[PDB]
Write a protein that binds this ligand. Structure first.
Ligand SMILES: Cc1cc2nc3c(=O)[nH]c(=O)nc-3n(C[C@H](O)[C@H](O)[C@H](O)COP(=O)(O)O)c2cc1C
Ligand SMILES: Cc1cc2nc3c(=O)[nH]c(=O)nc-3n(C[C@H](O)[C@H](O)[C@H](O)COP(=O)(O)O)c2cc1C
Ligand SMILES: Cc1cc2nc3c(=O)[nH]c(=O)nc-3n(C[C@H](O)[C@H](O)[C@H](O)COP(=O)(O)O)c2cc1C
Ligand SMILES: Cc1cc2nc3c(=O)[nH]c(=O)nc-3n(C[C@H](O)[C@H](O)[C@H](O)COP(=O)(O)O)c2cc1C
Ligand SMILES: O=C(O)[C@@H](O)[C@@H](F)c1ccccc1
Ligand SMILES: O=C(O)[C@@H](O)[C@@H](F)c1ccccc1
Ligand SMILES: O=C(O)[C@@H](O)[C@@H](F)c1ccccc1
Ligand SMILES: O=C(O)[C@@H](O)[C@@H](F)c1ccccc1
Ligand SMILES: O=C(O)[C@@H](O)[C@@H](F)c1ccccc1
Ligand SMILES: O=C(O)[C@@H](O)[C@@H](F)c1ccccc1
Ligand SMILES: O=C(O)[C@@H](O)[C@@H](F)c1ccccc1
Ligand SMILES: O=C(O)[C@@H](O)[C@@H](F)c1ccccc1
Lengths: 332, 332, 332, 332
C-alpha cells in the first residue's frame, strides 16, 4: 500500500456491500460527505525552504501525553462489522504506532477489554436517556484508564442515512453494543460530565464559532471541528472550512482538532497549517481493518507516519508547531 | 420513497413525455432552471449544537393562520395533466398535512370546488385583459374562503419554452381552464387588487431589491422571491441568490418567501437560514401526484415534514425562528 | 429554428469540414473562444417587474441612424465560402431586418456591389501596407454610402489558427478578395483615417481600459470591446469581462459595442445590462447563410428579434436604455 | 508540430511506459502537478492595441548575457533516459536557439562535456552530504564556463512519486550520474555557495514571499518560483499563483523566474505579464528529445519562439519589458 486509497479498494473487495455502505455513506444527498474532500482539495500549502531538518519530529503533546503523530483514531461504532477482532485489532495497532485510539460508547468489544490493550485510549460518549447512566460510562472509562472523554455533541439523533434505508441495513446478530447489558445532549449535559471527571472533556462536532467559544467557557479541554463525516446534517459546512476562524476565536483556550476526509499526510499538513492541534481519521482506519486486520491498521499508520514526516520536511517544518505557522492559499 | 428524487423517477415512468417536458422544462437554454439547483447546492449551513430540542416544532404563523411546515404548494396550472383527480388530490393531501395550497387562475378544476376541500387555500392571480374581470376572480376567491392572493408579477407573457415548442405541446381536449366560461400587470394593477380585497396580497416573482422595497411600500403582505422555476426570463438570477439581500432590505415589512429547486428538508433549512419566512414547492408535488395521486402527495409531504424536522434538530433549532438565525457559508 | 443552436447543427451538416473549421475555430488552444461563452454563462440578470410594457421597442439610434435591434452583423471575411450568394445574401437579409451589416475589406463580393443592396452598410478596414491605399478603401466605402468605418485594431497579423494549419486550409480558387485587383495599425493610422473621413470611426478589438479611453481621446465614435472571437491572442480576456469597466471609463464619450459568443436574445440583454450600446454577431449569421442562404439569415434575424423583445419585456424593459440600467449578478 | 502538445503525443508513443511515467509524474495524488496547469488556464491577458511593432524582440538580458527568448531549459536529471544523445542533444539545440541550458548535478553526461557544447550553460546544484564536495561541483561548473549556479532548495529529499513506486522504477544500467565517480540544504549552505563563486546564485523552488525576500537579503542573483513541477510537496501552491506577490516583495532586487506547466508562447506571455523575468521549461523539452533527438528539441524551441513573438505582438508588446507591464484578469 502506497496511499490510503489503496486500502479503500482493498476494503471494497472484501466487505459485504451493505457493510461497505454503512461505512462509506453519509446523510441525505451526501453533499457534506463530498464537501469534506472538496474543501481539502482546494487548500494549497505555501512551503518554506532551507530550514534545519536535522531532527524532524511528528510528535505532539496532547491531553497530557505524547503522541507519535498529530492524529488519533476517530470513534467508529461496531468495529466487529469490519473484522472479527474489531476494536481490539485497531487498538493494538494504534498502541504500537503511538497514536491515541477513541473507544466508542457503541463499541462491539467492552471498553474495559479495549482499554486493557494499553496505549493511549480515549473514550467517546453518547448521552443516554438519563444523566446517571451517562455518568456511569464516564466513570467506567476513567476507572479503566481512558485519558479523555470525547463527548459527541452533533447527534441529538442519528442522521438520515439513505444507503442504509435502501439496503434495509441492520446489525448482524453477531455484533452487539458490548458496553450495555439515548437523548439529545445540551450544555447542561456537558457541565454534568465536566463535574463528574478530572479527565479533559473534548466536544466533538462543533462547527459554529460561537459554539467553539462557549466550549472554552464551559471548561472543555478540546473540541473536534467536524460535520461527523457528512453523516449528520446534510448540508453542514465541512469542519476544515470553519477551522481557521475557530482557531482564531479560541485564542489557545483549548485544543482544536478537526476531522472529515483526512486521507494522507499532506492532508494532515493542511489541517495543521490551518491551525489544528491534531486530526481524527475514521473511514481509512476501518478500510485497513477490513483489508488485513491488525496488520492492515499497522500498515496504514506506518504509511500515514511516513507521509506526515515527508510533507512536514518538504514544507520546511521540523515540528508540528512549525507546521501550524505555515500559510495556505485557496485554489480551484 | 426516501427522497424527493425517488418521486421524480416515478413520475418520469408514468407520464407521457410531452407532459413530463411541460412540467420539467424551463425557458431558453434552461440556464435559470439549472442555476436554481446550483445555487442551493453552494449554500452550506453552520449548525448549532447542544440546544434544547425537547419540543422541536416546524410550525409557522403566516397570513393569519398556523401552517404545519414553513412551506406551501406552489401554483402549478392544469394539474389534471398529471393525474385524473388533479387539483382536488393535491389540495386534499395539503389540507391533511396542514400545508397551504395555492389554487391557480388556470386550474383544471374550479376554484370553488378546490376551496370546498377545506384546508388553507390561497389563490394565485394572473392579470387578465381587463381590470374588472381580474377583480372578479379575486372576489370569487375571497368569497370561497381563500386566505391570500398570490399575484404573479413575472409573467407579462409566457416565456419561450423550447421543449414545448419542439414537442408541439398543447393541452389535451380533456383539460380545460375551469375558472373560465391576459395582460401585463403593473404597479397600478397591484393597487387595484389591494383596494379590492382585505386579504393579504403576495407578489410572486420579485428578484430586484428595489422591487421588494416597493412591494412593501405598495402594501403587499408578502413577496415570493422567484425566477418562476426558470420558466420565464432565461438568465434571471435564482431567487435564493437574492433572498438574503431582499430580507435585509424589507426589514420585516412583509413576509419573504422563496421558491425554485427546493427538493429536501435540508433545502428548506437553507432557505430559512438565508431569511425566508417559508418556501414554495412546485415540481416535486406534481411528481408525487403523477406517481400516486392523493396518496403520493401525502407521502411527499410526510417525507418533507420528516426531513425538515430532522434538519432543524440536527442544526440545533427548536423553531423556524431559530433556523432563520442560523449562519451559512458558500462552498464549491 | 427555435434557437441559434439549431442553425449551428444545420451548418455543420452542409459545410465541408475545413470550411466549418475556418468558421468555428480560434487561435492556439481555443481558450479565449471557450471563455467568450463561459463569461456570458456566468452573468445573470436581475429583472424588474410591473413596469409599463405597452410599447416595448428594441430599436436604437447609433451612428446617426435607427436600427431595429441593438445588433449589427459582425465583419466576417470571404462569405462566399459559406454560400454562393455570400455577402449579398447576408446584406439583403440584414437590410430587410433593419440591422446594420459590416462590409469587410476581405469581402468576396466588392464593397460597391454589397453597398448597392441598400440598408445600413458599415465598412470594416484592415490597415494595408501603405497609408494611401488604406485611405482609398475608406474613400470608396464612403462614396458607396457606408455609414461608419469599423477599423480592426487587434490584427497586426493573423493569429495562429491550428485547425487551419492542421487542415492545410486555403481559399478555393472560386473565392477571391473582390475589393482588390497588410501592416500593423497604430494610433497614427487611426488619426490618418479620422482625418480622411467625416464618417464615425469605430475601433474594433479594444480590451484594455486605457485603450478605450485613448480611443475616445483620439476622436473615435465607437469601440467594439472584443477578443476577435478568440481568433487572435489565445488567452486574451473576453470582451464581456472588460465591458462594464470600459463603459464606466468612457463616461458616454463614444458608443461601446461588444462581441464574442452572443447566441441569443438573452445574451443581447446581458450585454446591454453590462452597458453595451449594441452587440455584433458573427458565427451565427454564417451558420444561417450556410444552412439556407438569404432566407436562413432572415430566419436567424427574426428569431433574434423575437428573443430580444421577449427578454427585454420579461426583464421589465420597454426600451434598450432601460435594459442598460438593469443590474447583474455573477453566478457559477 | 504546431503545438507543444503534439510533442507529448509523440513522446508517449516512443518511450517505455515507466520512463514516460518518471517524466510525466508528480508526488502523491498529483494535485500540485494538475494545479500548475489549472493556474495558468485561469489567467487571461488584457492585450494592448495600436502600438509600434516595427522591431518586436523577444530577447532579454539575464545574468550578464543576452538570451533569445525569456526562457531557459529547466534542469532535468538523467536525460539519456529519453534519447541516446541525452544532454548533448538538448544542449546543442539550446545553444543554436540562443536559450540557456541548465546542466544538472545528476546529468547522464559529465558537466564538462555538456559545457564544451558552448552556448549559455547554467549549472544546477543539489547539496551533497558534505560542504567540500558540494563546493567542488560548483568550482567545476565555474571552471567549465557555466554562467549561473541554480541551487535547488526544495529537495531536502525526493518526494513520494507513486507512479515510480508502483512501476518499481530504477535507472537502467546504461544510465549513470556522470559527474560522480545528498543532504538538506539550509541558508548556511546558500552562503557557503555564494562565498565560493562569483557567479550569480539562483535559488530554485521558492514559494513563500518571506523566502523570496530572504533570498535577496542572502545575495541571490535570482530565484525560480516553483513547486518542482508537482514532484516535491503534493499540495504545494503553484509558482504562478505566488509570482505576482513575490515580484512585488522583491522590488527588483533579483531576477524572478517561474516554472511549472509552461506549454506555449501564450503561457510565457502570461508569466511575463505576472512579472517573471523568464520561465523554465522542463517536460516539453524532454518530449521533443524523446520524439526526435536534437532536431526535435530544435523544432520545439523554434515553435516556442514563434509562439512567444506571436503572443507578444498580438498583445501590443515590442519587448519583454512591455509584456511585464501588461495587466491580467482571472477567469474560470
Ligand atoms: C461507520 C462510522 C461510525 C461512526 N461512529 C461514530 C460514533 O459512534 N461516535 C462518533 O462520535 N462518531 C462516529 N463516527 C464519525 C467519525 O468519528 C468521524 O467524525 C467521521 O467518520 C469523519 O472522519 P472520516 O472522513 O475520516 O471518516 C462514525 C463514522 C463512521 C464512518
Ligand atoms: C408546470 C408548471 C406550471 C406552473 N404554473 C404556474 C402558474 O400558473 N402561476 C404561477 O405563478 N407559477 C406557476 N408555476 C411556477 C411555480 O409556482 C414555481 O414558481 C416554480 O415551479 C419553481 O418551483 P419548483 O422548482 O419547486 O418547481 C408553474 C410551474 C410549473 C412547473
Ligand atoms: C470566419 C471569420 C472571419 C472573420 N473575419 C473578420 C474580419 O475580416 N475582420 C474583423 O474585424 N473581424 C473578423 N472576424 C471577427 C468577427 O467580426 C467577430 O469579432 C468574432 O467572430 C466574434 O463574434 P462571434 O462569437 O459572434 O463569432 C471574423 C470571424 C470569423 C469567425
Ligand atoms: C524528469 C524530471 C527530472 C527533474 N530533475 C530535476 C533536477 O535534477 N533538479 C531540479 O532542480 N529540478 C528537476 N526537475 C524539475 C524541473 O526543473 C522543473 O522545475 C519542473 O519539471 C516544472 O517544469 P515543467 O512543468 O515545465 O516540467 C525535474 C523534472 C522532471 C520532470
Ligand atoms: O455515524 C454513526 O454511525 C454513529 O455516530 C452513530 F450515529 C451510529 C452508531 C451506530 C449505528 C448507527 C449510527
Ligand atoms: O472562509 C474561510 O476563510 C475558509 O473557510 C475558506 F477559505 C476555506 C475553504 C476551503 C477549505 C479551507 C478554508
Ligand atoms: O410556468 C407556467 O406554465 C405558468 O406560470 C404559465 F406561464 C402557464 C400556464 C399554463 C400554460 C402555459 C403557461
Ligand atoms: O450575493 C450574495 O451574498 C448571495 O447571492 C450569494 F452569496 C449566494 C450564492 C448562492 C446561493 C445563495 C447566496
Ligand atoms: O478572423 C479572421 O479570419 C479575420 O479577421 C482575418 F484574420 C482573416 C481574414 C481572411 C482569412 C484569414 C484571416
Ligand atoms: O471584473 C468584473 O467586474 C467583470 O469582469 C466580471 F464580473 C465579469 C465576469 C464574467 C462576465 C462579465 C463580467
Ligand atoms: O524531480 C526529480 O526527479 C529531481 O529533481 C530529483 F528529485 C531526482 C533526480 C533523479 C532521480 C530521482 C529524482
Ligand atoms: O492571489 C493572487 O493574487 C494570485 O495568486 C491569483 F490571482 C492567481 C491565481 C491563478 C493564477 C495566477 C494568480
Amino acid at each position: 500500500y502506497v496511499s490510503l486509497a489503496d486500502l479503500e479498494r482493498a476494503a471494497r473487495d472484501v466487505l459485504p456491500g451493505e457493510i461497505f455502505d454503512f461505512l462509506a455513506g453519509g446523510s441525505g444527498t451526501e453533499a457534506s460527505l463530498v464537501a469534506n474532500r472538496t474543501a481539502l482539495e482546494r487548500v494549497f500549502v505555501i512551503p518554506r525552504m532551507l530550514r534545519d531538518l536535522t531532527d524532524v519530529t511528528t510528535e505532539i503533546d496532547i491531553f497530557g501525553r505524547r503522541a507519535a503523530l498529530p492524529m488519533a483514531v476517530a470513534p467508529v461504532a461496531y468495529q466487529r462489522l469490519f473484522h472479527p477482532e474489531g476494536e481490539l485489532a485497531v487498538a493494538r495497532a494504534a498502541r504500537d504506532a503511538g497514536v491515541p485510539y477513541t473507544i466508542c460508547t457503541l463499541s462491539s468489544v467492552s471498553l474495559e477489554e479495549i482499554a486493557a490493550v494499553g496505549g493511549r485510549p480515549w473514550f467517546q460518549l453518547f448521552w443516554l436517556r438519563d444523566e446517571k447512566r451517562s455518568l456511569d460510562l464516564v466513570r467506567r472509562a476513567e476507572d479503566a484508564g481512558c485519558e479523555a472523554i470525547v463527548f459527541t455533541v452533533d447527534v441529538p439523533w442519528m442522521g438520515r442515512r439513505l444507503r442504509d434505508m435502501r439496503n434495509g441495513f441492520a446489525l448482524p446478530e453477531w455484533v452487539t453494543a458490548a458496553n450495555f447489558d439515548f437523548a439529545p445532549a445540551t450544555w447542561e449535559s456537558v457541565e454534568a460530565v465536566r463535574a463528574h471527571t478530572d479527565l479533559p472533556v473534548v466536544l466533538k462536532g462543533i462547527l459554529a464559532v460561537e459554539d467553539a467559544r462557549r466550549a472554552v467557557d464551559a471548561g472543555a479541554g478540546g473540541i473536534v471541528v467536524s460535520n461527523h463525516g457528512g453523516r449528520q446534517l446534510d448540508g453542514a459546512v465541512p469542519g476544515i472550512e470553519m477551522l481557521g476562524e475557530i482557531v482564531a476565536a479560541v485564542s489557545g483556550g483549548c485544543e482544536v482538532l478537526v476531522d472529515g476526509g483526512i486521507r494522507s499526510g499532506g492532508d494532515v499538513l493542511k489541517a495543521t497549517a490551518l491551525g489544528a492541534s491534531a486530526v481524527l481519521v475514521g473511514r481509512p482506519v476501518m478500510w485497513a481493518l477490513a483489508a488485513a486486520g491488525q496488520d492492515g491498521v499497522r500498515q496504514l499508520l506506518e504509511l500515514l507516519a511516513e507521509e506526515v514526516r515527508d510533507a512536514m520536511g518538504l514544507a520546511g517544518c521540523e515540528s508540528v508547531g512549525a507546521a501550524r505557522r505555515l500559510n495556505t492559499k485557496l485554489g480551484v
